[PDB]
Amino acid sequence: PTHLSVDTKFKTEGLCVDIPGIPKDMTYRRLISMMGFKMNYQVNGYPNMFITREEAIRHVRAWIGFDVEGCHGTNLPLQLGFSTGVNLVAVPTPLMYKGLPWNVVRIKIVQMLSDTLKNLSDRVVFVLWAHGFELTSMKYFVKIGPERTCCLCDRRATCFSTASDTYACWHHSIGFDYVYNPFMIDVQQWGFTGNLQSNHDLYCQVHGNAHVASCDAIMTRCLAVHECFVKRVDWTIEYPIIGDELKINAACRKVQHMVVKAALLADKFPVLHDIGNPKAIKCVPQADVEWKFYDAQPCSDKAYKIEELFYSYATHSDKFTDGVCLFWNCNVDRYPANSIVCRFDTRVLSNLNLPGCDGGSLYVNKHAFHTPAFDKSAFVNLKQLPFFYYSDSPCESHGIDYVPLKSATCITRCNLGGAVCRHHANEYRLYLDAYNMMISAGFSLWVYKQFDTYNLWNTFT
Numbered sequence: 151p152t153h154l155s156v157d158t159k160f161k162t163e164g165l166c167v168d169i170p171g172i173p174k175d176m177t178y179r180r181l182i183s184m185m186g187f188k189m190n191y192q193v194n195g196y197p198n199m200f201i202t203r204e205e206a207i208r209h210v211r212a213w214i215g216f217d218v219e220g221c222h223g224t225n226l227p228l229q230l231g232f233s234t235g236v237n238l239v240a241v242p243t244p245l246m247y248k249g250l251p252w253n254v255v256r257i258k259i260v261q262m263l264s265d266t267l268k269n270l271s272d273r274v275v276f277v278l279w280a281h282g283f284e285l286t287s288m289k290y291f292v293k294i295g296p297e298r299t300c301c302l303c304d305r306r307a308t309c310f311s312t313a314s315d316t317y318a319c320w321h322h323s324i325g326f327d328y329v330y331n332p333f334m335i336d337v338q339q340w341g342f343t344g345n346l347q348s349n350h351d352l353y354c355q356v357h358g359n360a361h362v363a364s365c366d367a368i369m370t371r372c373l374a375v376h377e378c379f380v381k382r383v384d385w386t387i388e389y390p391i392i393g394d395e396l397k398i399n400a401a402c403r404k405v406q407h408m409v410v411k412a413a414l415l416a417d418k419f420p421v422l423h424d425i426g427n428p429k430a431i432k433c434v435p436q437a438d439v440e441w442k443f444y445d446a447q448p449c450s451d452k453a454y455k456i457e458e459l460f461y462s463y464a465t466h467s468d469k470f471t472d473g474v475c476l477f478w479n480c481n482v483d484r485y486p487a488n489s490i491v492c493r494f495d496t497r498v499l500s501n502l503n504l505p506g507c508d509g510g511s512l513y514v515n516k517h518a519f520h521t522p523a524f525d526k527s528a529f530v531n532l533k534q535l536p537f538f539y540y541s542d543s544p545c546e547s548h549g550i551d552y553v554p555l556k557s558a559t560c561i562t563r564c565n566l567g568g569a570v571c572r573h574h575a576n577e578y579r580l581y582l583d584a585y586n587m588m589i590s591a592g593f594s595l596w597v598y599k600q601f602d603t604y605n606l607w608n609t610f611t
């Protein structure tokens with residue numbers, strides 16, 4: 151019960167316009183054969199081209215929407231569309247490209263998938279709303295066989311060259327002409343009524359149809375992400391490390407302690423309302439304040455309405471207007487003015503951030519968190535939190551070479567007294583590095599308007 155059995159049934163109703171007469175009774179085994187491939191009863195780690203929803207979900211970083219449309223099968227030119235927004239035209243003889251034979255079109259397909267996937271995944275998962283021409287066009291740019299390794303490294307092979315008779319991973323595939331052991335999944339097997347557009351458009355206003363292949367390709371992956379990460383959410387699934395996940399997570403813990411510790415020292419709030427992750431611990435355990443926790447899961451769909459988060463069954467609702475509210479990745483429509491806020495900017499370009507549904511994004515760092523579209527209007531009662539470092543810790547090296555530090559934002563006893571000590575200079579530069587890691591990773595920080603670092607200087611006297 152791990153891999154999809156080739157003897158599992160495939161519903162063929164979706165195929166019967168491109169492929170009139172298709173059997174109603176069809177397995178993957180007979181489908182794969184009809185697509186022109188031979189699985190030669192092989193136990194070499196590639197039991198099926200098609201995969202389970204669960205396997206697709208574990209390999210979300212690999213998803214590429216794929217769609218083909220008749221343009222004017224062997225007779226006529228095909229439009230090949232990918233969720234990268236690329237459209238190629240193959241002949242048998244937003245980016246749109248002119249008609250070319252399969253022998254060159256297939257080279258472009260390897261280049262495009264390699265550049266897209268090399269920093270994301272060991273594989274490709276073609277995500278389909280299958281009507282026939284996509285499945286019957288794969289023989290023109292795919293080869294299958296036993297699992298294999300790169301000729302230049304230890305990564306599993308994803309490409310093949312007919313020039314050299316060799317195999318490559320995504321990193322090493324320059325000049326390769328065939329996709330090797332792709333995976334794929336037909337969204338239409340999941341139990342949907344009506345066409346792609348009419349299902350996509352229930353959930354997403356951001357992707358339009360121009361009746362071109364890359365738009366269906368984009369809409370297909372959008373609808374898949376909706377089904378697997380918005381309506382359904384499995385926070386048990388771990389995902390591999392592929393970048394700065396560990397540094398970014400550590401940065402986030404450091405900045406949070408810094409910012410909340412400072413907020414308490416500056417304005418001496420008697421109560422902090424900690425709204426979000428129900429696992430959460432006091433980020434400033436030594437602080438003087440009444441720490442009151444409030445449970446809420448990541449909203450993956452729409453931002454929480456502050457009205458419904460606080461004052462539903464307001465049967466003596468807690469005084470959320472007293473003290474300060476901490477929303478650490480707890481997304482609401484409009485934050486109260488007495489708030490400290492970390493909010494992920496869905497618009498960021500990174501290897502951890504994949505395009506999502508209805509202007510939102512899928513942030514994959516240890517877990518997958520689909521995140522509602524970033525909206526500036528959420529922050530109207532707040533301001534951007536300016537950078538600063540604060541320490542009450544004694545000046546004392548205990549031991550990373552030095553250039554004497556000058557900064558207006560180094561809030562320490564030493565800088566008050568004129569000259570930053572070596573210890574606080576190291577800590578300052580380390581904290582600035584963490585802070586920049588975090589920001590570039592896409593997190594944005596916002597605070598109550600009365601917040602002023604000038605108030606921190608009187609905590610040394």
Ligand SMILES: Cc1nsc(N(C)CC(N)=O)c1C#N
Pocket residue numbers: 444458459460461462463464465466467468
């Ligand atoms: C008493 C109580 N039950 S529910 C609740 N909140 C804040 C959540 C909500 N949805 O209103 C409170 C409080 N305080």
Ligand SMILES: Cc1nsc(N(C)CC(N)=O)c1C#N
Pocket residue numbers: 447448449450479480481494513515519520521522
């Ligand atoms: C890294 C992280 N920790 S919890 C979280 N949430 C609540 C997801 C969200 N929907 O905003 C994020 C993000 N991003």
Ligand SMILES: [Zn+2]
Pocket residue numbers: 300301302303304305318319320321322
């Ligand atoms: Zn390699």
Ligand SMILES: [Zn+2]
Pocket residue numbers: 350354355356357368369372373507508
């Ligand atoms: Zn969409």
Ligand SMILES: [Zn+2]
Pocket residue numbers: 544545546562563564565570571572573574
């Ligand atoms: Zn110092």
